[PDB]
């Protein structure tokens, strides 16, 4: 099975060094990729320039290890990098590392939206919170229903950085039956962030 | 058939020397000649050897620093390659020909029949 | 000059079949090999087969072995991927991509040459229902910003898209990536930010389109009346 890519934050300028995850294997090719655009020859053989690529772009073999070096970070290189080897007849691509840029911490925008009308004649409730234009990534949410903590009945969804601003949007979202809305009154969902110097929370009362 | 051996990894200002083998007669062969192909460019002539004569043809980019040369007993033609550099990276091909090549395409991928695998050459430091 | 041109994805059902095209130009292809690799939504490259047609040199990834088969007509310049026992996990942008002729017999500890041209991709559905979505309000609250949106729920198979007031809004919004929900529906949220004076006045509505279904659902999102 195919993974989730890992991630490393830099700024401009920042020099960085992705190791290769080892396997008997062959000399490692590393490719680039940008979202919904083909990947990209960068290096072979461990440490050849494709043609055309940039020479901040290096590899070395270390003995055992793969690396590739962005000797001076420019923004055109926020990108995900692949390593690949083969072994036999069978070629591998390891686990994307998606290099991210680094920004000043912005603390989340919180937003909490009770399930509509329409909705619950279908005999299920959503409830939705949006964490707005934050840096970095990492937040946590917890639901709370009349104070009673909740687990395993929300799902989150997270967009890439931002073009402009570099941040992350992320929803939360609680899914529920109709009766079971219906049940409860206090909604809140409580955000932990970086920027925020405690936890913030957003409530609504069913039915006002 | 030809194969060709003698690849491997050099520094800079290294030195490698490739053979390529030659099964069966080569009498009525008129080239032979090394090609490489590196990723994302075409295959390209280096050195021809016209056997018949001995003359050899060189690419610019080689010139002085790789030479042809044939023993004709072992049925053998080498590639003596010195003062590497990192752009002479790319697999390296055995090529032939028993038809006539006029002495200008002589170092064209499509004006030769018979290939080997090839050897690969990585230049680095 | 050299181009890779993938065609033929599409939705197909598990136990269907698809066969899916790479034209190649600008290069003797019985010179070369031609590899799939593919990518699943959000995950990373999967190599998934090659042909040396020259050779008839052939290889599959075990997660595909057995299921999918390679081919090649040289004359058309021509790679195929025939695809059966079609599993919802096979999901993915399939990429066609060149490589050396005799790529293993160079693979060594100094060598690997790696796939130089590539495809920009040929889209695989794999569904076994097709399902429309229902669209609902995220109605903004009572609070200089406010946030509204729409939750675009229950849908098979990806993708949605959605765009708000035919386009004409685009500044501050974010449309989530999708989530597989436990019924084995796809869901999603559109949110925007917007002055809090505007809503009184701005009509907002999203437009989201569902192409598998053939469905188109134009949704108002106001404030809720109290
Ligand atoms: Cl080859």
């Known amino acids: 099975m195919t993974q989730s890519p890992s991630s490393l934050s830099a700024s401009v300028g920042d020099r960085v060094t992705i190791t290769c995850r080892a396997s008997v294997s062959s000399a490692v090719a590393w490719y680039q990729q940008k979202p919904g655009k083909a990947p990209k020859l960068l290096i072979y053989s461990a440490s050849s320039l494709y043609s055309g690529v940039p020479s901040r772009f290096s590899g070395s073999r270390s003995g055992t290890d793969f690396t590739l070096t962005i000797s001076s970070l420019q923004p055109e290189d926020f990108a995900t990098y692949y390593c690949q080897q083969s072994s036999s007849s069978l070629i591998t691509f390891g686990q994307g590392t998606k290099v991210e840029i680094k920004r000043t911490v912005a603390a989340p925008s919180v937003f909490i939206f009770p399930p509509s009308d329409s909705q619950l004649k279908s005999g299920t409730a959503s409830v939705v919170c949006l964490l707005n234009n934050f840096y970095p990534r990492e937040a946590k949410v917890q639901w709370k229903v009349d104070n009673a903590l909740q687990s395993g009945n929300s799902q989150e969804s997270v967009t890439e950085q931002d073009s402009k601003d570099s941040t992350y949007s992320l929803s939360s979202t609680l899914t529920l039956s109709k009766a079971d809305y219906e049940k409860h009154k206090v909604y809140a969902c409580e955000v932990t962030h970086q920027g925020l110097s405690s936890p913030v929370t957003k409530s609504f009362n069913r039915g006002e | 058939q030809l194969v060709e051996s003698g690849g491997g990894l050099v520094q800079p200002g290294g030195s490698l020397r490739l053979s390529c083998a030659a099964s069966?007669?080569?009498?009525?062969?008129?080239?032979m000649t090394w090609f490489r192909q590196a990723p994302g460019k075409e295959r390209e002539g280096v050195a021809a050897?016209?056997?018949?004569?001995?003359?050899?043809y060189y690419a610019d980019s080689v010139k002085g620093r790789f030479i042809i040369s044939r023993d004709k007993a072992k049925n053998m033609v080498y590639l003596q390659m010195n003062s590497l550099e990192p752009e002479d990276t790319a697999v390296y091909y055995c090529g032939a020909t028993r038809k006539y090549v006029p002495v200008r395409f002589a170092l064209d991928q499509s004006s030769y029949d018979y290939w080997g695998k090839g050897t690969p050459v990585t230049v680095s430091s | 000059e050299v181009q890779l041109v993938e065609s033929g994805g599409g939705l197909v059902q598990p136990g269907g079949s698809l066969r899916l095209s790479c034209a190649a130009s600008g290069f003797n292809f019985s010179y070369y090999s031609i590899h799939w690799v593919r990518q699943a939504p959000g995950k990373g490259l999967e190599w998934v087969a090659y042909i040396s047609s020259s050779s008839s040199y052939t290889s599959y990834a075990d997660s595909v072995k057995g299921r999918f088969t390679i081919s090649a007509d040289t004359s058309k310049n021509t790679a195929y991927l025939q695809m059966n026992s079609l599993r919802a996990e096979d999901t993915a942008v399939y990429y066609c991509a060149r490589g050396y002729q005799y790529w293993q017999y160079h693979a060594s500890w100094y060598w690997n040459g790696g796939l130089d041209y590539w495809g920009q991709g040929t889209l695989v559905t794999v569904f076994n229902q097709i399902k429309g979505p229902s669209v609902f309000p995220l109605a903004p609250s009572s609070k200089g910003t406010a946030a509204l949106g729409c939750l675009v729920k229950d849908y098979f198979p990806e993708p949605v898209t959605v765009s708000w007031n035919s386009g004409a809004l685009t500044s501050g919004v974010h449309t989530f990536p999708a989530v597989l929900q436990s019924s084995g529906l796809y869901s999603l949220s559109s949110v925007v930010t917007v002055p809090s004076s505007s809503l009184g006045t701005q009509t907002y509505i999203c437009n989201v389109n569902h192409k598998p279904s053939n469905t188109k659902v134009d949704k108002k999102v106001e404030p809720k009346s109290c």
């Open positions: 069966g007669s080569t009498d009525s062969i008129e080239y």
């Open positions: 050897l016209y056997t018949h004569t001995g003359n050899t």
